[PDB]
Amino acid sequence: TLRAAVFDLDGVLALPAVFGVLGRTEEALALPRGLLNDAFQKGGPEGATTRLMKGEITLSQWIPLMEENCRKCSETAKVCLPKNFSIKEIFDKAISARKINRPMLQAALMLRKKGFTTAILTNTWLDDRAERDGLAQLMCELKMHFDFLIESCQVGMVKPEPQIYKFLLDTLKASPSEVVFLDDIGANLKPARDLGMVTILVQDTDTALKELEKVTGIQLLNTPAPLPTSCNPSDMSHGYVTVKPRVRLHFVELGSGPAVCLCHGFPESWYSWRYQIPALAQAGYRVLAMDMKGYGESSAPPEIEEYCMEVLCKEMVTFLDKLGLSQAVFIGHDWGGMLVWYMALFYPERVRAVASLNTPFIPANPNMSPLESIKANPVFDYQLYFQEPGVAEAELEQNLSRTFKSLFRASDESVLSMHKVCEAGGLFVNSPEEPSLSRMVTEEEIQFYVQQFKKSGFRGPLNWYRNMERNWKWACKSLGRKILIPALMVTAEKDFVLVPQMSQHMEDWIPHLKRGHIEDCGHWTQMDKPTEVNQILIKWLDSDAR
Amino acid sequence: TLRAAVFDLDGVLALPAVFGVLGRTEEALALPRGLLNDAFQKGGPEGATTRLMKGEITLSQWIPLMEENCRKCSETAKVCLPKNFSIKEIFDKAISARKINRPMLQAALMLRKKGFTTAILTNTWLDDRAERDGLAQLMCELKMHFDFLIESCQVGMVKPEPQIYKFLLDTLKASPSEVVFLDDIGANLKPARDLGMVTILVQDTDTALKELEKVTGIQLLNTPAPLPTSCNPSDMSHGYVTVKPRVRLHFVELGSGPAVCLCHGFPESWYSWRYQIPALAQAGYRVLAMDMKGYGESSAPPEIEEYCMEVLCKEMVTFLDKLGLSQAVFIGHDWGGMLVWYMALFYPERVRAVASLNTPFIPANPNMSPLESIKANPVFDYQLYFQEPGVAEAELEQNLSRTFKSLFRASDESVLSMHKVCEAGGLFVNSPEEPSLSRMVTEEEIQFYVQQFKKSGFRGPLNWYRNMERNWKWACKSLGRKILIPALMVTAEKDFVLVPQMSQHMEDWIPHLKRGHIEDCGHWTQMDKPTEVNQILIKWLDSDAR
Ligand SMILES: CSc1ccc(O[C@]2(C)CCN(CC3CC3)C2)cc1
Ligand SMILES: CSc1ccc(O[C@]2(C)CCN(CC3CC3)C2)cc1
């Protein structure tokens, strides 16, 4: 009975096999067959390559040794090496060409999700090349998805030596019969076979995966498209900045590159961006996912005025000041999307680019009070219910698990009408006490939101709605302005509150506005359609925001 | 009696005055005198420039209006504008050319250090240009040094309108007679004068500063070179990463750009880098100043083995993994300098560049036990005193303020002989109970170290020394390697423990090694010689580490 899966790196988790370049180089250079693959394994156990693979020497110390082996092999072969020959040039190109074998990673991910312990066992080197980062980046990406990464150059042992297999079994805490071992080199497979492990010789990925599903009894081939990588809260870097004596802002941070500041809506969390964080960091950005003022680990002062847009925007600028950031790209959803348009209008020098999910940019109407504006739309009637301090807090704080389960649902799973909350006298009046679990969330994900809202409740979050007159007067100062910095509006077909048609006039105030649209997508855009949100954001970031 | 100083931005805190470019452009283009300076102020109060300065319109909306004013002014002047004329091109260049007026900032810094409230009052705009970052960067740098920044485009008021001066006085909470106001425009000075404020018309900086010292009674001109900007712990972004179930690492983070990971020595803190953090961020780097394992807000497990170099280095790699960083440049001092060389030797793919202050790279001697090695040097005898668990902890924890005051001293202030700690039987035996305060530190800075060490004490920090045999065996694995990644060795003349001559053989293992040397510098390099450390590090970072 299997409970562990071990994968090789070269030719298994990463393709084309870096090793395959010696044969391709021989053919491209019309050199005798096997000359380069031979100079590579010269001396076997006490040869240069073994010492490299055991960590005795670095890759840059190995290059001159490989060239000496190429000369010696060529002499015996009675052939001359070409004039402009470079082992460095050949290896630099092979390494940079090698990419993650996506379906092999998907299978390893599926096995782990099913309770398998997974590991990478690889014969690798200590890379000190000026171009070492490309490889570091590949390793960092791959490794996060596995329980263990065992590298020959770190353990001082090499495949096929038996000691490395005994080491592998010890780190897995598994008997050989509980382990599938996948390798593209038959000689490196054999000691795992001799010990009694299930082994798979990997040539083409499809056959290898066919052998893997037959052996595990788990479907790995022709499987549905998996969800993007999520965040385990305890594995994230958590950041804290005091913006003023009583106010601190918490954020989760991942990656390197241009700063991307993610701003959630109501009643949410930094965790609402869980599917975006790993993807945006992988795309070459420094992600800062906020707990907005009033939420999670950020400060939640009780006063209404602490939540007017002007104060919220000023603190976000202070946040950038204290972290030492001259700019960030601001991406918001819902109330976060509203803050994001106002960041662009009032602080354009600090906003690299601006993007909103669902929330359109609507200017202030100088000839109509915000109350008179809510008069027009039946959609926004629940916002009047949010006005009286204490009322909505009580209903939303009454049962947290009920609150989040009732709210966080896909377009076809709705248990809340947000209509005549005025007639009804509550958000959950003719709503179930034990709502079913939406297909968008796990019970675990609901309990995270439940745990976050236990600290401060709903006062701070609901106060974002209690600044109508203040926000209107402040917004009226920007009536002569235009948003001329790079901007993205992402509409959601099935958001029945923030409908796509509400964004129809945006081009009048944002002429160069770029757009995205998600079909069959409800209000909770990030978790409803994560794959498409990621595709839209990454494409726009790489084109419009450095 | 003065207690507040107010400075203008253009022509006062930043030079050359962006305004001065209209006259320079006129002369360079042989256009009628004042034509451009005239089109700039066309319409006065309801003209385009006032609306821009009040925040009614953005800089990009203003450019076309300025061009229209240039045409109208040219028509009246009976002159034709040149063929390739561009207001954008002219203003882009003027803004990028304008730099901080360093001696004016120094004077504002000195006044604030003396208890003055300082402010910037400026007529500025909402910059939405594709090149807005250069200006954002200048504002972010300047603003941090002042109590208030008042911008016309944010307050919707403009100099010379009287309302802005009343607003200034209200934000300062000062009566006009308590305020010096410095401006380069006479018309903008007058309302402050009418109200009774001390005013200074600024033409050349020297005369302006002469007027300022006469008026404040504080020397601001010909003053000594000030210390680099330090860190106020409560104004920093604090980060936390769990590297394993029982271990979390704390760090302070500032800036954007390539990641620079700062690693302190014994018995120190992230705060030991206080003079480096603002300078390195200002230089275009993302600074991550660690609390090393066993220190400050980082975890301090009790076990000795938790502090062997192998485990310490593995956790630093995990730290990079969890933050999503493929690399960082590693800069270490003392024990941090030792970790930094080993990071380069074992994880070169993760180390962008490596730099050490004081600590040389010394390879393991395979023919000598670490005890036998301490036998040779009388210098390292105190390390034998550190071996027995509980002994040094008691003496160092006995009186914290005494511990740090006795240790943290310049080369000429030494109260500790670290000799015959074996003969003496303690680190502080013939040492004063109330050591004087070293010129390197304030009482406040000592109390920060005192407060940090109250959490975990000296067990974790002293455990870094209790892994001699383990570190030696691990280091012996790297005996065939060379450090071939960019490296910097910074020696300190007066460090009597980590002497410069101890670094003499480094080139044998690091051939491309770069060097720096600080004269009249003791062991506490960062606070002993901050200005020079910063100059050496920034120069090396800009040349060798992206
Ligand atoms: C007058 S412009 C405006 C419109 C809506 C608004 O509030 C929201 C952004 C809309 C939906 N609501 C969140 C509910 C959980 C769905 C917050 C705030 C301002
Ligand atoms: C065998 S190579 C070696 C040498 C020294 C060493 O320890 C230090 C880095 C030297 C000074 N000591 C800090 C004292 C407060 C001054 C730590 C560790 C290893």
Residue A5, number of CB atoms within 10 A of its CB: 28
Provide, as residue numbers in chain A, all residues whose Cβ is less than 8 Å from the Cβ of B485.
128, 132
Distances (CA, A) of B255 to A319, A328, B290: 12, 12, 15
Please measure the distance between the N-terminal and C-terminal CA atoms of chain B and give it in whole angstroms: 50
* Gap from A278 CA to chain B (nearest CA, Å): 9
Contacts of B268 (CB under 8 A, 6+ apart): B292, B295, B333, B334, B449
Nearest C-alpha neighbor of A520 from the set A501, A497, A495: A495
Tell me if B254 sits within 8 A of B236, measured CB to CB: yes
Give the nearest chain B residue to A545 (CA atoms). B130
Q: Is B286 part of a structural domain of the chain?
A: yes
- Collapsing DSSP states into helix, strand and coil, what is residue B519? coil
Residue A97, number of CB atoms within 10 A of its CB: 13
**d(C-alpha B314, C-alpha B494), whole Å:** 33
Contacts of A386 (CB under 8 A, 6+ apart): A392, A462, A465, A466
Any idea what DSSP says for residue A381? Answer: T
Burial zone of A332 (CB within 10 Å; 0-12 exposed, 13-18 middle, 19+ buried): buried
Burial zone of B130 (CB within 10 Å; 0-12 exposed, 13-18 middle, 19+ buried): exposed
Give the nearest chain B residue to A125 (CA atoms). B349
Provide, as residue numbers in chain A, all residues whose Cβ is less than 8 Å from the Cβ of B254.
323-324
Q: Is B134 part of a structural domain of the chain?
A: yes
Per the annotation, does B495 bind a ligand?
A: no
- Collapsing DSSP states into helix, strand and coil, what is residue B66? helix
Task: Extract the tokens encoding B243.
Answer: 């590297």
Contacts of B373 (CB under 8 A, 6+ apart): B365
Which approach determined this entry? Answer: X-ray
| Separation of CA B478 from chain center | 35
**d(C-alpha A172, C-alpha A194), whole Å:** 18
Residues A243 and A119 in one domain: no
Task: Report CA(A335)–ligand 1 centroid distance (Å).
Answer: 6
Question: How wide is the angle at C-alpha A145 spanned by C-alphas A139 and A146, nearest 5°?
Answer: 90
The residues facing A43 across adjacent strands are: none
Q: Which of A291, A334, A495, A544 is catalytic?
A: A334
Per the annotation, does B194 bind a ligand?
A: no
* A214: enclosing H helix or E strand: helix A205-216
Nearest to B238 among A239, A350, A482 (CB): A239
* A276: enclosing H helix or E strand: helix A276-282
* A22: enclosing H helix or E strand: helix A21-28
Task: Extract the tokens encoding A490.
Answer: 């992402």
* Gap from A258 CA to chain B (nearest CA, Å): 8
Burial zone of B39 (CB within 10 Å; 0-12 exposed, 13-18 middle, 19+ buried): buried
Task: Report CA(B334)–ligand 2 centroid distance (Å).
Answer: 6
* A51: enclosing H helix or E strand: helix A48-53
The residues facing B117 across adjacent strands are: B4
Nearest C-alpha neighbor of A139 from the set A9, A281, A16, A232: A9
DSSP string computed for A384-433? HHTTSTTHHHHHHHH-HHHHHHHHS--TTS-----S-HHHHSSSSTTS-S
Question: How wide is the angle at C-alpha B89 spanned by C-alphas B83 and B94, nearest 5°?
Answer: 130
Residues A131 and A57 in one domain: no
**Rounded to 5 degrees, what are φ and ψ at B251?**
-150, 160
Task: Report CA(B380)–ligand 2 centroid distance (Å).
Answer: 7
Instruction: Indicate if ligand 1 lies below 6 Å from the C-beta of A374.
Output: no
DSSP string computed for A316-343? HHHHHHHHT-S-EEEEEETHHHHHHHHH
Task: Extract the tokens encoding A339.
Answer: 């803050």
Residues A130 and A145 in one domain: yes
Ligand 1 atom, smallest distance to A383 CA: 7
Ligand having the closest approach to the CA of A421: 1
**d(C-alpha A479, C-alpha B51), whole Å:** 12
* A352: enclosing H helix or E strand: strand A351-357
Residue A225, number of CB atoms within 10 A of its CB: 7
Contact pairs from chain A to chain B, CB under 8 Å: 158
Q: Is A441 part of a structural domain of the chain?
A: yes
DSSP string computed for A476-534? GGGTT----S-EEEEEETT-SSS-GGGGTTGGGT-TT-EEEEETT--S-HHHHSHHHHH
Radius of gyration of chain A (CA): 29
Task: Extract the tokens encoding A544.
Answer: 């419009």
Provide, as residue numbers in chain B, all residues whose Cβ is less than 8 Å from the Cβ of A235.
242, 322
Number of residues that this document lists for chain A: 546
Number of H helices, E strands in chain A: 24, 15
Q: Is A388 part of a structural domain of the chain?
A: yes
**d(C-alpha A45, C-alpha A49), whole Å:** 8
Q: How would you classify the pairing of strands A148-151 and A179-183?
A: unpaired
**d(C-alpha A495, C-alpha B172), whole Å:** 48
Q: Which of B342, B449, B465, B495 is catalytic?
A: B465
Any idea what DSSP says for residue B151? Answer: E
Residues A124 and A54 in one domain: no
Q: Is B226 part of a structural domain of the chain?
A: no
- Collapsing DSSP states into helix, strand and coil, what is residue A132? coil
**d(C-alpha A362, C-alpha A373), whole Å:** 12
Nearest to B57 among A326, A346, A480 (CB): A480
Tell me if A313 sits within 8 A of A464, measured CB to CB: no
Distances (CA, A) of B278 to B9, B271, B285: 22, 12, 10
Atom 15 (ligand 2): residue with closest C-alpha? B266
Nearest C-alpha neighbor of B394 from the set B422, B415, B425: B425
- Collapsing DSSP states into helix, strand and coil, what is residue A267? coil
Residues A111 and A62 in one domain: no
Tell me if B43 sits within 8 A of B77, measured CB to CB: no
Nearest C-alpha neighbor of B498 from the set B394, B361, B331: B361
Give the nearest chain A residue to B126 (CA atoms). A348
Half-sphere exposure for B280 (CA within 13 Å, toward CB) = 31
Q: Is the dihedral of CA A513, A518, A519, A522 positive or negative?
A: negative
Half-sphere exposure for A13 (CA within 13 Å, toward CB) = 26
Residues A82 and A195 in one domain: no
Atom 14 (ligand 2): residue with closest C-alpha? B266
CATH of the domain at B54: 1.10.150.240
Q: Is B225 part of a structural domain of the chain?
A: no
Please measure the distance between the N-terminal and C-terminal CA atoms of chain A and give it in whole angstroms: 50
Residue type, B379: V
Q: Is the dihedral of CA A247, A252, A256, A260 positive or negative?
A: negative
Nearest C-alpha neighbor of A7 from the set A181, A198, A125: A181
Domain stop point among A74, A96, A118? A96
CATH of the domain at B389: 3.40.50.1820
DSSP string computed for A55-85? TSS-HHHHHHHHHHHHHHHHHHHT----TT-
Residues A166 and A264 in one domain: no
Is B449 one of the annotated active-site residues of the chain?
Answer: no
Tell me if A526 sits within 8 A of A273, measured CB to CB: yes
Residues A123 and A179 in one domain: yes
- Residue showing tokens 């050989």: A176
Distances (CA, A) of A129 to A9, A41, B325, B483, B485: 19, 21, 18, 11, 7
**Rounded to 5 degrees, what are φ and ψ at B252?**
-110, 140
| Separation of CA A423 from chain center | 42
Cα diameter, chain B: 95
**d(C-alpha A165, C-alpha A119), whole Å:** 12
Task: Extract the tokens encoding A27.
Answer: 């053919």
Contacts of A15 (CB under 8 A, 6+ apart): A98, A99, A101
CATH of the domain at B139: 3.40.50.1000
Per the annotation, binding residues of A for substrate are: 382
Task: Extract the tokens encoding A85.
Answer: 């020959």
Q: Do B253 and A323 touch (CB under 8 A)?
A: yes
Tell me if A54 sits within 8 A of A152, measured CB to CB: yes
Q: Do B480 and A156 touch (CB under 8 A)?
A: no
**d(C-alpha A509, C-alpha A512), whole Å:** 9
Task: Extract the tokens encoding A426.
Answer: 């509550």
Q: Do B349 and A127 touch (CB under 8 A)?
A: yes
Q: Is the dihedral of CA A362, A365, A369, A372 positive or negative?
A: negative
* A171: enclosing H helix or E strand: helix A162-172
E strand spans, B362-503: 487-492
* Gap from A190 CA to chain B (nearest CA, Å): 28
- Share of chain B residues as helix, strand and coil, in percent rounded to the nearest 5: 45, 15, 40
Any idea what DSSP says for residue B307? Answer: G
Atom 3 (ligand 2): residue with closest C-alpha? B338
Contacts of B304 (CB under 8 A, 6+ apart): B389, B463, B466, B467
Per the annotation, does B382 bind a ligand?
A: yes
* Gap from A104 CA to chain B (nearest CA, Å): 22
The residues facing B317 across adjacent strands are: none
**d(C-alpha B192, C-alpha B181), whole Å:** 7
Q: Do B348 and A324 touch (CB under 8 A)?
A: no
Cα diameter, chain A: 95
E strand spans, B163-245: 179-183, 198-201, 237-244
Residue type, A324: G
E strand spans, B236-391: 237-244, 247-254, 259-263, 286-290, 328-333, 351-357
Contacts of B331 (CB under 8 A, 6+ apart): B260, B261, B262, B263, B340, B354, B355, B356, B357, B537
* Gap from B475 CA to chain A (nearest CA, Å): 11
Number of residues that this document lists for chain B: 546
Task: Extract the tokens encoding A64.
Answer: 């001159």
The residues facing B289 across adjacent strands are: B252, B262
Nearest C-alpha neighbor of A32 from the set A76, A70, A86, A77: A77
**Rounded to 5 degrees, what are φ and ψ at B180?**
-95, 135
Tell me if A6 sits within 8 A of A168, measured CB to CB: yes
Q: Do B235 and A253 touch (CB under 8 A)?
A: no
Ligand 1 atom, smallest distance to A380 CA: 5
Q: Is A227 part of a structural domain of the chain?
A: no
Residues B242 and B291 in one domain: yes
* Gap from B19 CA to chain A (nearest CA, Å): 20
Q: Which of A165, A285, A449, A465 is catalytic?
A: A465
Ligand having the closest approach to the CA of A334: 1
Tell me if B481 sits within 8 A of B510, measured CB to CB: no
Tell me if B506 sits within 8 A of B373, measured CB to CB: no
**d(C-alpha B540, C-alpha B352), whole Å:** 13
Residue B530, number of CB atoms within 10 A of its CB: 20
Q: Which of B38, B183, B291, B334 is catalytic?
A: B334
Residue A22, number of CB atoms within 10 A of its CB: 22
Instruction: Indicate if ligand 1 lies below 6 Å from the C-beta of A335.
Output: yes
Per the annotation, binding residues of A for phosphate are: 122-123
Tell me if A141 sits within 8 A of A133, measured CB to CB: no
Contacts of B337 (CB under 8 A, 6+ apart): B263, B265, B356, B357, B358, B359
- Collapsing DSSP states into helix, strand and coil, what is residue B53? helix
- Collapsing DSSP states into helix, strand and coil, what is residue A329? strand
Instruction: Indicate if ligand 1 lies below 6 Å from the C-beta of A441.
Output: no
The residues facing A210 across adjacent strands are: none
| Separation of CA A79 from chain center | 51
**d(C-alpha A171, C-alpha A362), whole Å:** 58
Q: Do A484 and B349 touch (CB under 8 A)?
A: no
Tell me if B359 sits within 8 A of B351, measured CB to CB: no
Residue A468, number of CB atoms within 10 A of its CB: 16
Residue A525, number of CB atoms within 10 A of its CB: 24
The residues facing B122 across adjacent strands are: B151
Residues B275 and B353 in one domain: yes
Burial zone of A202 (CB within 10 Å; 0-12 exposed, 13-18 middle, 19+ buried): buried
- Residue showing tokens 């100083």: B5
Q: Is the dihedral of CA B384, B389, B393, B395 positive or negative?
A: negative
User: Considering its fold, how many domains does chain B have in total?
Assistant: 3
- A16 upstream amide cis, omega within 30 of 0: yes
Nearest C-alpha neighbor of B5 from the set B274, B235, B212, B253: B212
Is A465 one of the annotated active-site residues of the chain?
Answer: yes
Burial zone of A442 (CB within 10 Å; 0-12 exposed, 13-18 middle, 19+ buried): exposed
Residue A510, number of CB atoms within 10 A of its CB: 21
Q: Do A349 and B323 touch (CB under 8 A)?
A: no
**d(C-alpha B523, C-alpha B499), whole Å:** 9
Ligand 2 atom, smallest distance to B468 CA: 1
Residues B208 and B348 in one domain: no
- Collapsing DSSP states into helix, strand and coil, what is residue A173? coil
Q: Is the dihedral of CA B171, B173, B176, B181 positive or negative?
A: negative
E strand spans, A155-244: 179-183, 198-201, 237-244
Residue type, A338: M
Residues B532 and B468 in one domain: yes
Task: Extract the tokens encoding A59.
Answer: 């890759």
Q: Is the dihedral of CA A410, A414, A415, A420 positive or negative?
A: positive
Task: Extract the tokens encoding B202.
Answer: 């600024």
Q: How would you classify the pairing of strands A237-244 and A247-254?
A: antiparallel
Is B542 one of the annotated active-site residues of the chain?
Answer: no
**d(C-alpha A418, C-alpha A383), whole Å:** 10
Q: How would you classify the pairing of strands A14-15 and A4-7?
A: unpaired
Nearest to A326 among B133, B322, B349 (CB): B133
Helices A309-323 and B133-143: crossing angle in degrees, nearest 10, is 80
Task: Report CA(B464)–ligand 2 centroid distance (Å).
Answer: 10
Provide, as residue numbers in chain B, all residues whose Cβ is less than 8 Å from the Cβ of A239.
237-240, 253
Domain stop point among B64, B96, B128? B96
Task: Extract the tokens encoding A459.
Answer: 């006062």
Q: Is B369 part of a structural domain of the chain?
A: yes
**d(C-alpha B325, C-alpha A70), whole Å:** 37
Tell me if A180 sits within 8 A of A5, measured CB to CB: yes
**d(C-alpha A209, C-alpha A219), whole Å:** 9
Domain stop point among A46, A64, A96? A96
Nearest C-alpha neighbor of A197 from the set A154, A164, A158: A164
**d(C-alpha B224, C-alpha B513), whole Å:** 34
Nearest C-alpha neighbor of A512 from the set B68, B60, B53: B60
Any idea what DSSP says for residue B30? Answer: T
H-assigned helices in A439-494: 443-456, 459-463, 468-475
**d(C-alpha B88, C-alpha B92), whole Å:** 6
Task: Report CA(B335)–ligand 2 centroid distance (Å).
Answer: 6
In this structure, the residues whose C-beta lies within 6 A of any atom of ligand 2 are: B 265-266, 334-335, 338, 359, 362, 497-498, 523
Residue B205, number of CB atoms within 10 A of its CB: 16
**d(C-alpha B428, C-alpha B401), whole Å:** 13
The domain of B53 spans 17-96
